[PDB]
């Protein structure tokens, strides 16, 4: 039942170092609205997540997938490590739009980001050190 969108918005607003005032200027929601959204005093669905996504600078569907984790696990690993996710996703996103082997093989960028982070973790590799060109080779490997 529960979405946890309130927590997701608060956490991502903080992750992107935005004041409620700034997110308000950008989204068109007042600070009172954003506070009630964040605190669970006002329901959040698809239509609010479209606005928040644009305001945060994070594709709306990622908030859907983070919400999906909470429901499927009790918490979101990705939200807990959003810094690692933002970094890997920037590489996955780039590979998808600039490499034919990815564009003609990829099934889902968010699931592939998660698969790659799990692979870096198991290999004891740090996502902020890895070479793009090496990420690309790991990516082609998980798709094949």
């Amino acid at each position: 039942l529960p979405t946890h969108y309130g927590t997701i918005i608060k956490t991502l607003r903080k992750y992107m170092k935005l004041t409620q005032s700034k997110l308000s200027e950008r989204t068109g929601f007042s600070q009172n609205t954003i506070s009630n959204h964040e605190n669970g005093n006002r329901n959040i669905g698809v239509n609010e997540i479209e606005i928040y996504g644009k305001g945060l600078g994070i594709p709306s569907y990622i908030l859907h997938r983070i919400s999906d984790e909470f429901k499927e696990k009790g918490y979101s690993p990705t939200l807990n490590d959003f810094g690692k996710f933002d970094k890997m996703y920037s590489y996955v996103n780039k590979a998808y739009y600039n490499d034919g082997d990815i564009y003609y093989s990829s099934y889902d960028l968010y699931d592939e980001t998660i698969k790659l982070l799990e692979l870096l973790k198991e290999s004891k590799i740090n996502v902020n050190d890895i070479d793009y060109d090496y990420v690309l080779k790991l990516y082609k490997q998980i798709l094949s």
Binding site: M16, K87, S90
Partner: protein
């Protein structure tokens, strides 16, 4: 472009039809009988010529019923705005059994797909885009 002009090339043609003012395509009708065996194709003539409105091409597109019930599909499909010949529909029968077309059968739709006619420009290399790069924000 408000006008789709057509002319009959034979007595066998049916005027294209559109039930609703906001249907995606005009219905195209076979002008002849054809038997498409399993896993074969045929070129079905309409015996109409068309003059598409300016800024579109004519896409010959599948009927949902023929696709979902009889495993029928449309290959080809691109009609250039300058094409004044007989509009042909390339039907693909991927079904297990023969597919019968009779004169006057509705076999496809014609969508006026709006398109650009861009000029071509070579550059030494294209930059990875601002959306095809960068982290969040």
């Amino acid at each position: 472009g408000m006008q789709l002009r057509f002319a009959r090339l034979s007595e066998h043609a049916t005027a294209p039809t559109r039930g609703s003012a906001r249907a995606a395509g005009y219905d195209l009708y076979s002008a002849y009988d054809y038997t498409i065996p399993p896993m074969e194709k045929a070129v079905v003539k309409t015996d109409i010529q068309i003059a598409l409105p300016s800024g579109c091409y004519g896409r010959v597109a599948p009927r949902s019923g023929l696709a979902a019930k009889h495993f029928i599909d449309v290959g080809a499909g691109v009609i250039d705005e300058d094409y004044r010949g007989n509009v042909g529909v390339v039907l693909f029968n991927f079904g297990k059994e023969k597919f019968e077309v009779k004169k006057g059968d509705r076999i496809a739709q014609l969508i006026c797909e709006r398109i650009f006619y861009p000029e071509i420009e070579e550059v030494q290399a294209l930059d990875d885009t601002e959306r095809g790069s960068g982290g969040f924000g």
